[model samples]
Target chain A: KAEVVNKGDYYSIQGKYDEIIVANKHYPLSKDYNPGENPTAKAELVKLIKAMQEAGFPISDHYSGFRSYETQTKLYQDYVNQDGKAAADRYSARPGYSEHQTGLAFDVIGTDGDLVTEEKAAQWLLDHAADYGFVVRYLKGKEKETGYMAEEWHLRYVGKEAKEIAASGLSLEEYYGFEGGDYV
Target chain B: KAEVVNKGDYYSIQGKYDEIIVANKHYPLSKDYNPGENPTAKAELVKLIKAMQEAGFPISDHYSGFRSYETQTKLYQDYVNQDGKAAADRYSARPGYSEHQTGLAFDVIGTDGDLVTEEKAAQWLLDHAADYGFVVRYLKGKEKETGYMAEEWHLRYVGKEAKEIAASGLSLEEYYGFEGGDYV
Candidate 1:
């Protein structure tokens, strides 16, 4: 029988390999561990893009896909330098605490590079993303629970569990029964 | 001759009183001086509201009007606590630096308390606010100069200057030739 994975902080599954690893402010991944790009996630994303395109909502895949630990560190540091640590903490995650490092997170952007303001594309994604095994990671009104503002562009792949998570209408933290707040 | 107040840093006009004084991150008002309410702003707002209603763009004035120094202080502090200082600075104004303290700034919202997302109302305001001596304060694409995100709901009364300012398509900071950036 396969080993049952316990869900908690990242340390709970640090060395143990689990397909669904939670990376957040409270649950951070190790800097040394880089999942790179998951082929399964890419395949699903490709199908999602094609479906959306056929439905007349062509989203740009330029900003989508995985990010490295170093990339996240630089991005977070840049935000901190530009906006200060406090503001960066609310929006950008620190290196080890980003979902991007898991190779399951991606950003959906409009052809024009606009994210939040892309009404049709955003609505289409929200209505159909779960069908493709993805979820709008940070939802509005669940900001307190997620420790982040609403990010309409961010999507996270959780395979078959995406539909259940989306249907629950709770943040990832709430879904996992984790104590989440502004950790930074 | 009346002193023609030059728009600049808050320190320049600290003790001076001007009906159309500028207030922002760089230009702050004193806590001692509270211009309770401006009849001009109220009357103009009423006219604007009536016009919007006539145009089938009925908007709620529930979140409209002036704010006190203490109120602004608490609001800014609350955002800092909830989000963080940097995020607060980008979206919320520090107590004395807020335009609300000047009795010339007001917010227009929908019956649902939504602002920018209320497309019809927001568009109407953007197109017609100048006619009623108001300007959409924080505009799109000028976030860096304004040191804030686009706020379609925020309106600032600038009397006869409103038209010219709107026509210029420049943020208040740009109009004043101030070096605007994230000051927090």
Candidate 2:
């Protein structure tokens, strides 16, 4: 918190000099920070798919990648209309607060037009995602810490640190020494 | 060149894990060496692509990287399928005798989903790649030294040593004092 810098419209963590970037309820991103689907994450996802296929999962690409700030605004506003702001905030990220805008986070979908929520496939990702530098970000029990419900399909690419984070068994917020939950 | 030992089937080099590993025409990889694209190289490669995008190049994930021995067999034969075997071997290496098997090498690609071979793109990669711990492995005018056509798209990761190697203007084989040019 002390090292976090206010970038006028959005707050940025100190690790910007390095590759690990963060965007959550506490630290939002700027509208200007949008880049398309990250090539690195795309490639890693392909590799993960191949690994899963080899492991008999038949996982193929249906990835939902790189939500723009502009795109999120309409989506979030619509969510707010469908539910209240509180519920929307709990389930949906505000325009600039989404990890997907980082282009390094994605929502996984299966080949057959469904999210790959089958137990064995989900178990495989939770078990082996760290090797590919990814994490099932909203873990089953850390919803409060993550300020959201457990989304077993959402993945965040933290590069080499994902293994350490997974090993620590801490929520990403706790691992990064930041405040999360209920949107300060 | 001097230290390579004749293993019954192929050649072997010394330093097994004490120094860097090298894969080339002279040193064939085992079929068992398929660990897929290396995590370390994949992470750093993403960093390079991000930096390059910031520099106004919208590079994407069209990279040709980390061919499996089986995959190499198909690719090499496909090259032979289209072109003459002798001409195809000049560009695509036979299975187990390629740098791509090491998982640290990649051929550059552009945002347009085509191989990047333009002069400016090539120059940019050659000039700035060492900063990210990579090198254009096949240098211009070193075809005889490297035993292949000058492939500007080819990149090899050498960690901190890449900066020194790139600075020396030496073909990787020359820098390592290894003999290059065609399979034995």
Candidate 3:
């Protein structure tokens, strides 16, 4: 997900996961491939990069990209949604509800040769990221608000302060003091 | 603690626990004094009041005073440092840290016939709080950062957007990306 670039009509995917598969320009994927994850968030990534540099890690010239939930379910349909009815409905139209569409989230990891991995870099981030303002988005204990099981390798870019607060182990709902509401 | 008020020097205490001794002006409980246990925390009480109002939990005029950490150490001292350190130094002073000194934190639960509790009009606030932007401070799981345990009765005053973010279950650390660096 870190290697795809959106260019209005189509997207350019980079890296070794697979070859560049440019779908039809007019197709929905053509407009913006729902990675079902976050994109290269500006503030959080910048802070992470800075922290990595300070911690003496080999900083890279490249940053990571975010994927939407829509994109993830579509790409890994079999593993993500094996159930027939509801899962299929949820998986069918890769449109709204994906963090990627919101443009407020992103995936982060360590740099492999040119691309970053979801293992080493991700672990490094988890270990010493509070000072950099990043936190593993889907943590083990945060079930009620996150609405998903823990995804240690998946990172979300909330912002430095927000990330630090999350890393403190408080649920986003608790930290922000959300009692439940309809406002966006 | 809610049942005592301070007007300059002399203090008036009225509760099951009486004969309360007020700290002298010269002895103005060390800024490091256990705010939760200290007497006459105008600053802390004020912040609490304002934050509650902003969060839509206004206080009733028949308000009484706050309790001392000495009285209810378990609940009030949930966030207090046992060693008795200053909030500014340790970074977790509860209302003592910001509100006590600034007169910002308060106990609005006194609206119930001179003894306020979240059960009173504050309950209205608990229901539709997102609209006002207030969140109780020092909750469970945030022991590391907030330096206290959960206090459903105590509230913290963050602005609307910031409060909204906090309520969304994200901490200031995550939302602002505060990685504890040189960025003020």
Candidate 4:
């Protein structure tokens, strides 16, 4: 279950597994709230990337570890202008509503040095991500629950519960009993 | 433009056209904030309904008008349990996120005494609703923008600008530059 930590300028939630510092369509961050890349999560991501690299899966360094609120605003605005808000919403988050703003979420690069998206290496990340204290943030069938399309390269650090959550086949929102699925 | 009147429990936004009392996934209302129903909006709705009835549209006065926070909460929970959250969400609103809470949105009834849903009455409503200071809320092509399927029978009162808004072929969100599509 999740508990409300604070509900002031920026909302905060805490779960039994870890701090569910959410930055989704349902829960937004404040513009002034700017926490950089989480060191522990980054270190865990590096270990996972190296592990996959050693196992011959095309893996590189993390690509999108943590993005500030201002950075996300521009990124989302550019995507909205280029692709329209409807199309951009499926992938990009609006400003304070980005997972990257949480500092706990991250994305990895491919061995070829581009984004590790939609490739066989992406599968390796989903399959072994739980072992590295991470869970594939968005999964194939849980798009409705996560409010985003399947993003195998994107992972969130949740310590020991990652393995249990991955095995349970429930989305993070479902696992934590949080509101998701296209916002409200 | 929508100006902030108050950023309290229920975020109060007043638009240039009207009080723009919003109740969407992005902007939610407070349970304690109950205004019952707006007399002006109800009168406007009655006029629209009478106009439709005189045109032989078989509209009944048994339409759902202003629903309180408690009523909406039960309605949504029942729907979520009956059809599951995903399916129910395609049609129902979640409690404080319902337009009915604003007392500006309403659903009509057919002479058959049921919800005037998925019927040809939609055409008349879409075509002439603006003349009565009302506008069809959800449109066919704007499912992605409104975050809900077309609800032609559902009309929202937006005062005199309804004509321009309807003629412009833009959703209220699009017309007012308000964030509507899917939560955040």
Candidate 5:
């Protein structure tokens, strides 16, 4: 039986209810809601990291994983201060609108500090991340659809659905058939 | 009269003798050769940056430019230390092989402290960089030709030639007619 829940204006199913809750400029999470430790996702990430390391790829565990609403507020505010509102909005989510608050998303960093510019490691992650139930969120050339710039280092866990999402080469917003126009 | 000088294996013009020296894995510079303080390029950059700022693009002067051989050596070594040789080789250049040593290249940073990922600022630079005698040096999808990953923030000063290079939509290496295969 498929269970459905309404997160603001977006619809999500039971399996991916919390996992696939689309948090963006349009669909924002509640400030009171905090998704703490997600053991399943962590286990899968551990497996993925170990496999990547064994394959001679220079990768590390999550540089950043979960974040509270307060933490997200501070981070986003800092970005706003540094880059201004428009630039910050394109890259940094506004507080409760962050995917990091879900506890299922993590940022992978290479030894050089960023995986996006590190060709081999970035390619490896893009190629094999789906096998481990992870998908590179905020894919390149999907800024309009994702409402965010490409973030090659950011990965989102969606259990077995990651393979389908990865194979489709669509952002989570597009995968779920969101039209992605300005909602606010 | 245009003077042509052969810097090792690469052919470059003497008018741009100080400005257009090719530096990469195949072509390298002398440890003693350091052309510092390009006034012409700086004046143009000021105009370019001012126009961009006026147009609501948050940009600033060179975050990195005009590195010495020793500086490049230390920088590349640091990257190698952090990301290993293969990763470093993909992104960072070896000492004398860096474009920054020529003083004609610069990496721009946004208020957020990064330029590559900043969409609007990056787009603005790409769209109008040539007008000020600058070109986005390491463009995306031309990594093989450039022998490096795409660096949207890195701009090369090529004087009047910049317009033609940008209009052709070719990497500097490609514009300069480098075949860009594995060259020893």
Candidate 6:
């Protein structure tokens, strides 16, 4: 996948909601930074989705997918709040600091694009997502820099090394020797 | 002019100069920047050029001109030595932190692209560039950061404030209270 500085044109396509049109352009809202696209990782995302479906966790329309900081925060506040341990960590994961800005992350739903209502999809993704190089970027127990709670849907593609670490259930910051700092 | 980072497309156009052909429709180098284009001082540059002509200075290329850093630098080394006093001031003025990297700056030349001739255009830009929001970014006595001698051919588009200051015989750093620092 491209670096966060070169996300390319990911924002331009239509969102999973079908009605939402994500403009594939950088919005220079912040003085020195803006979002970009990721073509290679986008293909990888499709492959992971297919693998999830083959593994019996067909995606739901309700899967919210990856979004900007504000939107992702709203998702965490509304959905992941029920998990006490995860929610505790969530409070510390600052919104604008999240990696979703890199466009290589996604918040999956169970086939309807909404949150996973069925236990099978969540469990299946947990067991097999590493096969596709996706990892739950933030998990239930680690709450230091991600600034959020455990979010099973917060999938991040950190390539192979990350997938191995995710499989081992270790936080990304721990493996990379980075405590949540400014992203990009 | 747009910051270099903001001008993603320039790199591609630049690559074309290096003989690299790209097939992508949205080549990163095709994008135009807004801040540096059609500045409010276009008329000012014209007036300054006229002053140079009136003063027996020669006119070279007008607006929408381009040149590499080496050309601009070498031109200054010859014409803008400023009795050598100006050279020292310029080194102290800009040092290595000159705006030459912006690639929007230029010099008065005998011919459009050739630098070997002693031309009237070179002298003209030196005398009146300040009137048109153009200023020699480095001076001979100011070599703390620029590390170069004074350059008369070198012209920078610093908008109105710095232009007025340069026209009035003050160094850009002194008028703007800017210490030699980062390139940007």
Q: Which docking band does candidate 6 fall into?
A: incorrect
lDDT tens per residue, model 3, A1-184: 2344566634434322322322211222433444433333555567666544433345564643444544545644553456664454332323333334444444444455343443334444554455444456556666555444455544444544643454346644445443211112
Task: State the lDDT of candidate 6 residue by residue for B66-116, as single tens digits.
Answer: 322344355546545654746534442221123433433544443254431
Question: TM-score: which is higher, 3 or 4?
Answer: 4
Alpha-carbon local distance difference test for all models: 0.70, 0.77, 0.41, 0.74, 0.71, 0.46
* lDDT of model 5, residue B53: 52
* lDDT of model number 3: 0.41
Can you write out model 3's per-residue Cα lDDT over B1-184, one digit (the tens) per residue? 4344443332323322233322211112222234342333444445446665665654653332333323222332343334332221243332211323322233445455443445645455444444444444444455444434334455443434424555556433333332211221
User: Residue by residue across B40-83, what tens digits does model 4's lDDT show?
Assistant: 88888887777565434568987787888999989998999999
Instruction: Give the RMSD in angstroms, all C-alphas superposed, for model 4.
Output: 19.2
Best-fitting candidate, measured by lDDT?
A: 2
DockQ of each: 0.01, 0.04, 0.01, 0.02, 0.01, 0.02
Best by TM-score: 4
Worst 10 residues of 3 chain A by lDDT: A18-27
Clashing pairs for model 2 are none
lDDT per residue as tens, model 1, B1-184 = 1232544433332212234576666557787557776788889888787655433343675665788899899999999999999888778888887778888888887766676456545655664687788899887898888776788888888877776666566786777565555555
Query: Which candidate, 2 or 3, has the higher lDDT?
Result: 2
lDDT by residue (A37-150, candidate 4, tens digit) is 889888888889888878887776647788987687678767767876556656787566678887888878776777777567777777888898898888889888888888
Residue pairs with colliding backbones in model 1 are A87-B86, A87-B87
Give TM per candidate. Answer: 0.46, 0.50, 0.31, 0.52, 0.46, 0.37
Better of 4 and 6 by DockQ: 4
lDDT tens digits, residue span A57-169, model 2: 85657787789899999889999999989878878888988988887888877778776789998989888998887999888789888887788788898766778888888
Which residue segments of model 5 deviate by more than 4 Å? A1-184, B1-4, B7-11, B14-19, B179-184
Worst 10 residues of 1 chain A by lDDT: A8-17
